[PDB]
């Protein structure tokens, strides 16, 4: 219901200008089409689609924000193009059988933490016309190795001596919590490894639980203290002007930052080493099981 | 139950070293005394009190954190001095009728947002021995005038043109939300004005709802865009070594930062001007009614 999350999303220029660039630079995708905006929030993506020449835009949001979207759409005189419907996309009555295009910003931290993709996929299976399109269409998840003994000490070792007192028992509560923060790209000590490719046209709900064996190509002899996760978002299908953005630490920071899994036992790596591990994602919410250097830890996102 | 709030509090050096300095530099207050730590969290203040020579420390917390405190107190071999009790201080059974000293860190944003002072005062009225002491004993709240057109534009004007679209209807949701952030002390355009003095020995619950007429002594000709609130914490009673810390923007930042009330209509002020207003605090939670320059706004803290 609250606007704070909407302000954070809207003020992310990488996020919001990627969507704008996609829609405005590929207007043939929207021209005289019926568009569904799943979880439309303030309705900005619905308005971009109307500006690109949409015949009709259905903006669906379950929360109080939809009342603000109703006012925003009237303030921009688009009420003849954009219809707003309050409710879960799984429950609402749409005034059409099918839609030509689905658009959504459904992505969570590490792509899948508190993500809306389940609801986007429900909307796809129920409402997308034969030969229609869903955007963004292609997503990847990547891991990269990190060396940051100081950040590791600030989070873990800290608990050994707190103003003269032992609190070492606190570390077992800290290690299993993934950290969302922007990484200094100087602390990256491997090439990235892709662990997941999603095409929204063909992926099912069951595909979003997955396991990947990975190889981190180590680029610096150092103490590996953490594995960082991030994701890349692609607008491809039928585009003359393809759009991509990365939430990786080598790219301009976004509100998604990067997801960091601290190692209980940091371990030394060598430039040239092929560091092999296994990662598994499970839902209910989201957990990430990591095996590396012959130990295993499951992480969750608070 | 969660450790994140405990880590934030413990990593605030101003907060935690003020309490440490108070207890270690005034050990006569603790020497062979019975001490009650209201909402003890990880039990750090209970351990400082045992180190200063407390005969017995009762640490009370309602949340899961108390189980970690039990382990922490054993890890530092203080289980013969510190007894930990899980539950609301309003409900738990204490193994004593009375205590000599009550200590607590109960303070919220703007002192009173999501504060524990109600529970500290219940503990005082029920458990403090005749002639005992409560720490910290003295609190003040202050207001100061702010000029920051750029921050005001980032929060308010922003909504007028969002990637070509009007969202001006969003401003009425934004203005009533107080912002918690660290202020550039360069943006302060008045002397502070005190609006509230609390002595924990004598204040009742009813005193924490209050009204104050105030005068801001303007020190710079500028556009007044906001009023900032903060608080000062005093350890006085029976101290040889008095301790104070301020959460004001002229002082080292704390986890409490400063509370900022944006003006809907910024207005020009002159150096030398005595700017008069009225502030009122109400509970349930907390709201702050501000009258200044012939308009009134009620603010809450999200
Ligand atoms: N950028 C993010 N992006 C994904 C999630 C944002 S929720 C975005 C919007 O979608 C709405 N919504 C959620 N589930 C459904 C549903 N089943 N049916 C209809 N409306 C729904 C919700 O009311 C909200 O306004 N997340 C994020 C944002 C800030 C910080 C961290 C992550
Ligand atoms: N520094 C802060 N300081 C005040 C509040 C912290 S709560 C501090 C601790 O007190 C416990 N507690 C709260 N009410 C009661 C009760 N009635 N009876 C027993 N135990 C209680 C709570 O489980 C928690 O561990 N607040 C703060 C912290 C971080 C960010 C912003 C404000």
């Amino acid at each position: 219901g609250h606007y704070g999350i909407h302000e954070e999303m809207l003020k992310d220029k990488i996020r919001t200008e990627s969507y704008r660039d996609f829609i405005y630079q590929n207007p043939h995708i929207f021209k005289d089409k019926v568009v569904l905006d799943v979880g439309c929030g303030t309705g900005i993506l619905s308005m971009f689609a109307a500006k690109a020449g949409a015949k009709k835009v259905l903006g669906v949001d379950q929360s109080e924000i939809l009342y603000q979207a109703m006012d925003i759409i009237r303030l921009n005189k688009l009420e003849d193009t954009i219809t707003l419907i309050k409710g879960k996309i799984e429950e609402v009555h749409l005034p059409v059988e099918k839609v030509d295009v689905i658009i959504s910003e459904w992505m969570g931290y590490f792509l899948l933490f508190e993500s809306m993709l389940d609801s986007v996929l429900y909307a796809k299976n129920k409402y997308l016309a034969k030969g229609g399109s869903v955007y963004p269409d292609i997503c990847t998840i990547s891991l990269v190795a990190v060396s940051d003994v100081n950040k590791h000490a600030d989070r873990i070792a800290f608990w050994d001596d707190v103003y003269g007192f032992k609190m070492s028992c606190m570390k077992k509560a800290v290690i299993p919590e993934a950290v969302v923060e922007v990484l200094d790209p100087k602390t990256l000590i491997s090439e990235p490894c892709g662990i997941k490719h999603i095409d929204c046209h063909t992926t099912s709900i069951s595909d979003l639980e997955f396991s990947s064996d990975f190889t981190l190509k180590i680029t610096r002899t150092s103490m590996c203290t953490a594995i960082a996760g991030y994701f890349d978002i692609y607008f491809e299908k039928n585009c003359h002007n393809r759009v991509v953005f990365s939430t990786g630490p080598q790219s301009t920071k976004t509100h998604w930052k990067q997801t960091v899994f601290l190692l209980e036992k940091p371990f030394s790596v060598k430039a040239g080493e092929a560091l092999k591990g296994k990662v598994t994602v499970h839902k209910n919410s989201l957990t990430v099981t990591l095996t590396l250097n012959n130990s295993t830890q499951t992480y969750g996102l608070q």
Side-chain angles (χ1 to χ4, degrees), chain A residues 1-4 6-12 14-50 52-87 89-96 98-129 131-150 152-204 206-216 218-264 266-269 271-275 277-282 285-300:
Chain A
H2 187 62
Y3 76 86
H6 294 289
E7 170 171 20
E8 188 177 4
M9 290 185 300
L10 283 173
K11 284 191 173 167
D12 185 342
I14 297 304
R15 168 207 186 262
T16 306
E17 300 179 1
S18 292
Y19 273 90
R20 184 214 46 210
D21 284 2
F22 159 59
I23 296 169
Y24 285 10
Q25 292 174 21
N26 304 275
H28 61 283
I29 290 170
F30 293 92
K31 185 53 180 158
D32 300 325
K33 299 303 188 176
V34 179
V35 177
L36 172 68
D37 181 357
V38 180
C40 60
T42 52
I44 188 71
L45 304 189
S46 281
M47 299 199 284
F48 295 150
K55 174 142 68 207
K56 185 61 65 196
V57 186
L58 310 171
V60 177
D61 203 298
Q62 70 184 17
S63 107
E64 300 305 293
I65 199 69
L66 190 86
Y67 297 131
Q68 283 281 336
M70 277 166 163
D71 283 353
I72 285 165
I73 267 51
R74 293 185 165 283
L75 222 50
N76 299 274
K77 309 201 124 69
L78 290 168
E79 60 275 28
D80 295 356
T81 304
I82 306 176
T83 305
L84 301 162
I85 310 171
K86 190 148 177 296
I89 188 54
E90 299 84 339
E91 299 175 348
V92 289
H93 175 83
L94 295 198
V96 279
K98 300 297 200 193
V99 305
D100 300 309
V101 179
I102 291 161
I103 64 184
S104 183
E105 198 279 77
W106 50 260
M107 292 87 70
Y109 295 137
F110 195 54
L111 195 72
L112 295 176
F113 181 62
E114 274 175 17
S115 105
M116 180 157 59
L117 183 52
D118 292 354
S119 303
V120 169
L121 284 184
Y122 178 92
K124 199 257 288 162
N125 293 321
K126 190 180 178 169
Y127 292 117
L128 197 63
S133 300
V134 54
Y135 296 99
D137 46 319
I138 299 170
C139 306
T140 66
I141 306 170
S142 296
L143 299 181
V144 60
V146 180
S147 179
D148 199 332
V149 291
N150 298 329
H152 193 283
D154 293 353
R155 192 138 151 89
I156 306 297
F158 170 76
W159 295 102
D160 289 327
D161 189 354
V162 179
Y163 301 103
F165 301 96
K166 292 173 156 51
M167 305 198 169
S168 306
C169 50
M170 285 292 275
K171 288 169 167 172
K172 72 182 136 268
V174 170
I175 285 290
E177 291 271 342
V179 181
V180 176
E181 69 179 34
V182 177
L183 283 176
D184 186 349
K186 293 192 179 205
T187 65
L188 301 178
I189 58 153
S190 80
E191 286 172 13
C193 195
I195 57 164
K196 188 55 164 174
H197 179 290
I198 287 167
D199 192 311
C200 289
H201 289 103
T202 59
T203 188
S204 63
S206 58
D207 285 320
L208 305 180
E209 293 197 290
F210 71 96
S211 287
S212 176
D213 302 295
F214 61 84
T215 307
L216 293 171
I218 305 305
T219 58
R220 190 200 299 158
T221 301
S222 50
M223 192 62 43
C224 186
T225 56
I227 303 299
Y230 63 89
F231 66 87
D232 301 357
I233 302 291
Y234 295 84
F235 301 85
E236 205 137 279
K237 186 182 173 178
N238 286 337
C239 294
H240 290 292
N241 296 309
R242 287 175 169 192
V243 180
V244 58
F245 73 85
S246 185
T247 59
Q250 302 276 45
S251 299
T252 301
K253 64 195 223 278
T254 79
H255 81 278
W256 288 286
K257 304 166 169 192
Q258 294 94 44
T259 303
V260 185
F261 314 103
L262 286 182
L263 299 180
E264 180 172 348
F267 69 97
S268 60
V269 295
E273 185 178 343
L275 182 57
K278 198 181 176 170
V279 60
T280 300
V281 179
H282 300 109
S285 46
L286 198 81
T287 65
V288 181
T289 301
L290 206 59
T291 303
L292 190 73
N293 194 36
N294 296 300
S295 67
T296 298
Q297 177 65 49
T298 302
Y299 300 92

